[PDB]
Design a protein around this ligand. Structure first.
Ligand SMILES: Nc1nc2c(ncn2[C@@H]2O[C@H](COP(=O)(O)OP(=O)(O)OP(=O)(O)O)[C@@H](O)[C@H]2O)c(=O)[nH]1
Ligand SMILES: Nc1ncnc2c1ncn2[C@@H]1O[C@H](COP(=O)(O)OP(=O)(O)OP(=O)(O)O)C[C@H]1O
Ligand SMILES: [Mg+2]
Ligand SMILES: [Zn+2]
Ligand SMILES: [Zn+2]
Lengths: 49, 348, 148, 199, 197, 343, 103, 65, 50
RNA sequence: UGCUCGC
């Protein structure tokens, strides 16, 4: 719920009081079917290291 | 004149975690300035603060009076509060990655040549230990190959130099002590140290942890003062990570996988327990079931089913512990008591 | 000669409690000349042993046969005629315990010497006459040589 | 189903800890607010702020719980004796018999510096000395050790070896530890008790 | 634009929240036979007490996937089994348990135990040391009670709570408590009449 | 016997089922009785050798025999960090209308390698942000994206609709300073790959910037690292304790690498043997087969290191190894000069 | 100001010396440790890092007899320099013959 | 947002192999064979190219232009 | 938040900081590492003597 | 004042 990552495709025009974005977000390699259902892979919030 | 000088090295400074349960939650330390942006301290003092380095924020206060500074350094000194006033047990002691490192170091399998032993010994020669002689101990085996055991390297921590008057002596039982060896246990779990030299046994939480008495650091504190115990703890915290990194300690999915005999035993135990539970259910529902004293028939059935499930659990755990091979990282960390236990291993 | 003890032993068991350690084994040995039992930790990786092996073992106060007890420091690089030249497996330890036998309630004549070679345990048990010269906090050399 | 039951157990533990935090916080606050007034005076009597005496002596004996080496006992005589024997091994002095040990103990204990010590600690020291003397006597009777010091196997003297130097060192160490383990006057004993009960 | 440093909180998608303890150079990092150096080194001791076998399974599945160019599924009560990813690892020439032969970067000698390498999906949290760093000079005070303000945005100071006062009482440091709670916080000089009080 | 075990400990590193043994270097004087491990320059020069097995552009592989793990790790670390190169450090921006952030753009530009020879430049002194001809290089990047005047009616693909919408590193133009144009021929100072995608643009947006590059080492920042992957591994030597034949021999070919174990029909029956232990990666899959565990002995040669050096294209890897050895020699000479100045 | 010597105590004993080396790391420390450990007159050689924040290392040398422990330091440095020169020459010759035989 | 130029672990140049990879996706090549043909032996570059999401065009769709 | 509990028994003080903690085994047990930034803010009044 | 968080 506090993970840092992209918000949406309009995150650049969006102006909020506090926003955290990731430079090079990457979709997880081990993804649950729920991730595909909620389309989280289109907006990842982490990196694989 | 008054000069509002910056915080420099040597200033007594209070360090506290806002959740305070006992008095040891706040201690007066010596400030050393570092270019980073976090409050860094020795992890051995983590047990009093009850910190876990997962985002905890701690407070740091600077007294504005010489009298307050002296009172903080004397009464709330870290070396002067190594034991809690509740029961006298030492709280500032070795912790995870220090119990396991010292345990793997003091194992009987360890045999170091001259170069590796010299490196591990020199890994602690920093700070106030830069003005003392090394005092390389004589090797144990010398004719076939000149090898230094890990126990001598660990004892070097107790008595680094020749002029050091520390003479540590201890005789206690370990966690995996059999109960009959009396310093001749097959597992080598009887700790015996004479003249700051580890004569027998392997270090663990029972001897290096903050559990209770018989700790080597507690013995040093009670026999030779606070400074010697603090120096020994610093040498341990500087030596154990170096050896633990140079040797390598990892856990994998293969360290927790079950064996074939373990699977067969688990299947047989599950079958037997389910059959006995079905027999108890049939006895209670149809017929008369032996009622245990002090409870009803339903509570008796509940107790019997819990007993059978616990039998299955403990027998599967014993089978897993027997089928597990040595050098297993979960089993190794469970034996030394650094983290986890046999119950967690059996569950996982 | 600083030889405190010397006897030929035969191994009767290698690991009575299982293969606990990869490099170290707990050999049990019995002497032929006397009834001296020996429970000794040995390194099989560098000095392999078998069940039926028979070896001569010598516990000496000093490593030099001339009687010079000057053992302030040991230099492995120094080359000189010493006792270790006549043996194959040499260890350096300290006799850290002398314990009387408790099995015999009365008229007991058996003692046991516990020596810690850097954690490797050696219990030499037998008649107190053979253990003459053994004292606590005394550093000694063990020399073991396998025989045919 | 097993995952659901495990999550139930985890949530039960979480709510238990959540209630425990606040409950023990309130209990600690009450205990400290009640016990913060007591202090150890210089006359070894714990008195309140108004001057009323709560105890004529703290704990009945007057020892520091932080300096309690044993299980609610000031010293572990066995470990102290072993440490004295190991640190100061005198090879040029003969062993002591039971009678000689008792005699030297009675001679050393009757000195002036041991008079200010409490009687219970002296009785415990006498009991430990009698026990170790009985052990030495049993060993010498088992192995036929003669008190004259002319037994041929000298290794027999290494079973239970004690010298008057070690006896003096042990007695002085025990006396110093008992003196340094007493309650230092001025300590806030009440706050320490409140914290050691609340934690 | 901020770079990870000491104090930044990191998560590993398994509740294993952590803080960057040290930033070592690349040459100090251990290396495998292929020459891959790890980005994040995590403590194994966190596994036994928490029993996070799911993290190991995710690591193994991710390694198999990046080896064969696939996306394994970690679906609840299902997903890719361990046998399939083990076969995928053994087919590509890697170990079937993730543990690989690794040489220490510092000493240049191989490690006695194999290291568990694999790609893990780590996520950075909003908790930063830069935003949480706070230091309070004399600064401003409140109008009602002349004491430091509450929050960091208000340039406030840390509060010595009741339990901290209890600890200071237990220690017996009267002068330190007096300096903290009277001299350094709300010291003032009033005028009292000795006749009427 | 005992001598065989001592030789195996002092020459081989055995890999067990649960852990690796004999990993510490022990050939030192005083550790062994029947061996004089004292330093000898003649024996070292006799036993040491270097054999290159593969060498192409931005890739090198060579075996060193006789060197130790300490010097090998030193060479590896010098190659990784202590080899200086040229990389972008300063970024002067003029009206960057791109969606990509300015700091992110500068960070991406800094990671772009430069084909300039670092030996011909010097380290910039403390400060001196203006830069001189000797210790800096300038790269101008000016890309203005606009709509294509001639395109299809639909033009769904961005390539047909817009021009210069993807700012590749080929748009970077080296701007000579002073006499750098005469010293460096045209085409030498340029981006290495020439195909790195820096950013993507849209009509109206423009990216105008200048990049000041100075000499630096990889220890300060990873952007100066010339080698992509510079590592070394011990040469494996798989040995068979007993002759393995039959169908189980085929299992060997399936347990190890496909190219190390070969099966041959000497008498009409298949027997396995070690063909090329170099190709093996030590997957330790032979431990799964219960019967075949006690028939093989996996080991690594202690004094045989295969170095694999894949560079980023700044300079050939042989020159990289030479410069690493030269940097180590320079450190040794600097410390010797300091010691001589002390005494 | 890079390499500084420190005696074991105020007595200024040349048997046990500590060399503090600035702007260095594990590379040169381990290389010099290996090159000087083979000296038969060295009882104890060991390098350590004070703190990962600062770039400095501390080597400690204790000899057997009356060696000033500075002569083994220079010996190890010269031996490492000779080894580096030899490996450089060998690598250059190897690369040259490889280029010759490839064409 | 955009493909990084350098690999996080090793440091191999990977930004220049992105669009061509997309070409291999426009062709009949799968993921594994395309990553093999691109020259990525170690799995770190394979993870870098495979787990990367191309969010630059989605942002340019919201660009002023 | 009353006067006794919020302003008399427990109150706020200056010359103090709050920061996240990170492990560092190379320091003694009686020593604590302070960042340079906080060290420049928290000042100590030293009296000029001989 | 409210609330979401951080242990
Ligand atoms: N609804 C609402 N009430 C507030 C707010 N801030 C303060 N209050 C009320 O005021 C009381 C606390 O006052 P403070 O927060 O101390 O006011 P302050 O910050 O000193 O005000 P300033 O001096 O202007 O900064 C609470 O009991 C709240 O009911 C707010 O933002 N919204
Ligand atoms: N409400 C609170 N009051 C006091 N301390 C708290 C509170 N919430 C968190 N903390 C601090 O955080 C610590 C709680 O961690 P703890 O409960 O021991 O582990 P955990 O959160 O269960 O982690 P696991 O779930 O076991 O991984 C201890 C305490 O100092
Ligand atoms: Mg926490
Ligand atoms: Zn008045
Ligand atoms: Zn890569």
């Amino acid at each position: 719920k506090q993970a840092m990552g992209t918000i949406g495709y309009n995150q650049r025009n969006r102006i909020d009081t506090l926003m955290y974005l990731l430079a090079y977000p990457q979709k997880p390699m081990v993804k649950t079917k729920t991730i595909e259902l909620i389309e989280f892979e289109k907006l990842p919030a982490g990196q694989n290291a | 004149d008054i000069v509002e000088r910056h915080l420099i090295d040597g200033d007594v400074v209070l360090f506290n975690r806002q959740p305070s349960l006992h008095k040891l939650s706040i201690m007066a330390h010596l400030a050393r300035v570092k270019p980073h942006r976090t409050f860094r301290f020795n992890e051995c003092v983590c047990t009093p603060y009850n910190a876990d380095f997962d985002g905890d924020e701690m407070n740091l206060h600077l007294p504005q009076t010489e009298e307050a500074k002296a009172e903080a350094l004397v009464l709330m000194g870290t070396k002067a509060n190594l034991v809690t006033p509740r029961n006298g047990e030492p709280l500032i002691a070795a912790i995870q990655d220090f119990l396991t490192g010292a345990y793997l170091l003091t194992l009987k399998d360890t045999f170091f040549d001259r170069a590796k032993a010299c490196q591990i010994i020199a890994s602690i020669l920093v700070g106030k230990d830069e003005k003392i002689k090394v005092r390389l101990p004589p090797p144990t085996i010398l004719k076939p190959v000149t090898l230094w055991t890990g126990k001598q390297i660990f004892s070097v921590i107790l008595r680094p130099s020749d002029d050091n008057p520390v003479r540590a002596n201890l005789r206690t039982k370990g966690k995996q002590y059999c109960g009959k060896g009396e310093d001749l246990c097959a597992n080598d779990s009887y700790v015996t140290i004479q003249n700051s030299e580890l004569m027998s046994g392997s270090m663990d939480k029972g001897t290096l942890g903050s559990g209770s008495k018989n700790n080597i650091f507690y013995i040093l504190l009670r026999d030779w003062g606070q400074n010697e115990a603090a120096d020994a703890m610093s040498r341990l915290a500087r030596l154990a990570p170096v050896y633990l990194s140079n040797r390598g300690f990892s856990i994998g999915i293969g360290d927790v996988t079950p064996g074939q005999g373990l699977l067969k035993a688990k299947y047989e135990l599950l079958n037997a327990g389910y059959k006995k539970c079905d027999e108890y259910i049939e006895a209670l529902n149809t017929g008369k079931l032996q009622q245990q004293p002090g409870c009803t028939a339903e509570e008796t059935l509940e107790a019997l089913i819990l007993k059978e499930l616990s039998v299955i659990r403990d027998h599967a755990g014993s089978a897993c512990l027997r089928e597990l091979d040595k050098s297993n990282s979960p089993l190794t960390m469970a034996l030394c008591g650094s983290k986890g236990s046999f119950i967690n291993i059996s569950q996982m | 000669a600083g030889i405190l003890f010397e006897d030929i032993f035969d191994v009767k068991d290698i690991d009575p409690e299982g293969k606990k350690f990869d490099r170290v084994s707990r050999l049990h040995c019995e002497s032929e000349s006397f009834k001296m039992d020996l429970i000794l930790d040995v390194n099989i990786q560098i000095y392999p042993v078998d069940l039926g092996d028979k070896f001569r073992l010598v516990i000496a106060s000093t490593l030099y046969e001339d009687g010079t007890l000057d053992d302030g420091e040991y230099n492995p690089t120094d080359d000189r005629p010493s006792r270790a030249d006549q043996f194959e497996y040499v260890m350096y330890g300290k006799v850290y315990r002398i314990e009387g036998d408790e099995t015999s309630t009365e008229a007991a004549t058996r003692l046991s010497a516990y020596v810690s070679y850097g954690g490797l345990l050696m219990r030499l048990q037998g008649d107190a006459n053979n253990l003459h010269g053994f004292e606590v906090d005394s550093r000694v050399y063990l020399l073991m040589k396998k025989l045919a | 189903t097993e995952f659901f039951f495990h999550t139930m157990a985890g949530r039960e533990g979480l709510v238990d800890t959540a209630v425990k935090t606040a409950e023990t916080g309130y209990m600690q606050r009450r205990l400290v607010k009640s016990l913060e007034d007591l202090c150890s005076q210089y006359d070894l009597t714990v008195r309140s702020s108004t001057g009323d005496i709560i105890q004529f002596i703290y704990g009945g004996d007057g020892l520091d719980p932080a300096a309690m080496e044993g299980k609610d006992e000031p010293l572990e005589f066995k470990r102290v004796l072993d440490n004295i024997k190991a640190v100061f091994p005198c090879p040029s002095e003969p062993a002591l018999s039971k009678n000689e040990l008792i005699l030297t103990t009675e001679s050393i204990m009757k000195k002036s510096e041991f008079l200010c010590c409490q009687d219970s600690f002296l009785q415990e020291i006498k009991k430990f000395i009698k026990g170790v003397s009985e052990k030495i006597k049993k060993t010498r009777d088992k192995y036929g050790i003669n008190d004259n010091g002319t037994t041929e196997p000298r290794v027999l003297y290494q079973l239970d070896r004690i010298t008057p130097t070690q006896v003096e060192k042990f007695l002085e160490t025990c006396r110093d530890k008992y003196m340094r383990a007493q309650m230092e006057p001025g300590s806030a004993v009440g706050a320490l008790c409140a914290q050691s009960i609340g934690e | 634009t901020r770079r990870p440093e000491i104090g930044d909180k990191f998560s590993s998608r398994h509740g294993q929240k952590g803080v960057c303890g040290l930033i070592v150079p690349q040459e100090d990092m251990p290396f495998c036979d292929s020459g891959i150096c790890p980005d994040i080194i995590m403590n194994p001791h966190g596994f036994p007490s928490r029993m996070t076998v799911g993290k190991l399974i995710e690591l193994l599945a991710g390694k198999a996937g990046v080896l064969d160019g696939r996306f394994h599924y970690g679906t609840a009560f299902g997903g890719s089994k361990v046998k399939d990813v083990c076969e995928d690892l053994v087919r590509h020439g890697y170990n079937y348990l993730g543990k690989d032969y690794v040489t220490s970067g510092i000493t240049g000698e191989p490690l006695e135990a194999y290291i568990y390498f694999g790609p893990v999906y780590y996520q950075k949290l909003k908790h930063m040391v830069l935003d949480k760093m706070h230091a309070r000079a004399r600064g401003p005070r409140a109008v009602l009670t002349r004491q430091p303000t509450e929050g960091r945005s208000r340039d406030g100071g840390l509060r010595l709570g009741e339990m901290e006062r209890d600890c200071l009482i237990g220690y017996g440091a009267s002068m330190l408590l007096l300096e903290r709670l009277m001299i350094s916080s709300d010291a003032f000089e009033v005028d009292v009449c000795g006749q009427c009080g | 016997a005992a001598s065989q075990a001592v030789e195996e400990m002092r020459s081989r590193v055995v890999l067990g089922e649960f852990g690796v043994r004999n990993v510490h270097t022990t050939d030192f004087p005083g550790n062994y009785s029947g061996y004089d491990d004292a330093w000898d320059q003649d024996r070292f020069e006799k036993n040491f050798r270097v054999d290159v097995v593969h060498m192409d552009e931005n890739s090198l592989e060579f075996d060193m025999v006789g060197i130790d793990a300490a010097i090998a790790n030193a060479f590896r670390r010098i190659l990784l960090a202590e080899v200086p190169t040229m990389a972008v450090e300063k970024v002067l921006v003029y009206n960057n209308t791109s969606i990509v952030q300015d700091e992110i753009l500068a960070h991406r530009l800094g990671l772009i390698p430069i084909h300039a020879d670092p030996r011909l430049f010097e380290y910039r002194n403390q400060g001196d942000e203006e830069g001189t001809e000797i210790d800096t290089l300038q790269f101008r990047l000016q890309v203005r994206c606009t709509r294509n005047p001639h395109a299809a009616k639909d033009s769904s693909d961005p390539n047909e609709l817009y021009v210069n919408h993807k700012v590749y590193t080929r748009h970077m133009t080296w701007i000579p300073l002073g006499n750098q144009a005469d010293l460096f021929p045209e085409g030498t100072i340029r981006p290495v790959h020439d195909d790195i995608l820096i950013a993507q643009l849209r009509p109206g947006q423009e990216i105008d910037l200048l990049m000041h590059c100075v000499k630096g080492i990889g220890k300060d920042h990873a952007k100066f690292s010339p080698v992509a992957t510079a590592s070394y591994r011990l040469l494996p030597d798989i040995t068979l304790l007993e002759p393995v034949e039959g169908e189980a021999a085929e299992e060997l070919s399936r347990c190890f690498s496909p190219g190390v174990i070969e099966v041959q029909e000497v008498q009409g029956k298949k027997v396995a043997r070690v063909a090329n232990p170099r190709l093996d990666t030590f997957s330790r899959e032979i431990f799964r087969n219960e019967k075949l565990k006690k028939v093989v002995r996996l080991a690594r040669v202690r004094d045989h290191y295969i170095f694999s050096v894949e560079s980023t294209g700044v300079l050939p890897p042989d020159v990289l190894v030479s410069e690493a050895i030269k940097v180590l020699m320079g450190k040794c000479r600097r410390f010797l000069d300091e010691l001589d100045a002390v005494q | 100001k890079t390499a500084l010597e420190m005696v074991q105590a105020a007595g200024t004993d040349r048997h046990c010396v500590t060399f503090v080396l600035h702007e260095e790391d594990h590379t040169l420390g381990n290389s010099l440790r290996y090159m000087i450990m083979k000296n038969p007159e060295v009882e104890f050689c060991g390098y350590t890092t004070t703190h990962p924040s600062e770039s400095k290392i501390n080597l400690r040398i204790q000899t057997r007899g009356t060696l000033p422990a500075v002569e083994p330091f220079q010996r190890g440095l010269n031996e490492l320099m000779n080894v580096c020169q030899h490996v450089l020459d060998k690598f250059e010759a190897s690369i040259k013959d490889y280029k010759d035989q490839k064409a | 947002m955009i493909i990084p130029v350098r690999c996080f672990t090793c440091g191999k140049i990977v930004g220049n192999k992105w669009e061509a990879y997309l070409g291999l996706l426009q062709a009949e090549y799968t993921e594994g064979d395309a990553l093999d043909a691109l020259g990525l032996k170690r799995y770190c570059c394979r993870r870098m190219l495979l787990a990367h999401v191309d969010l630059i065009e989605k942002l340019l769709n919201y660009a002023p232009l | 938040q009353g006067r006794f509990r919020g302003n008399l028994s427990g109150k706020r003080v200056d010359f103090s900081g709050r920061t996240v903690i990170s492990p560092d085994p190379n320091l003694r047990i009686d020593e604590v590492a302070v960042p340079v930034h906080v060290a420049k803010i928290l000042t100590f009044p030293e009296k000029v003597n001989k």
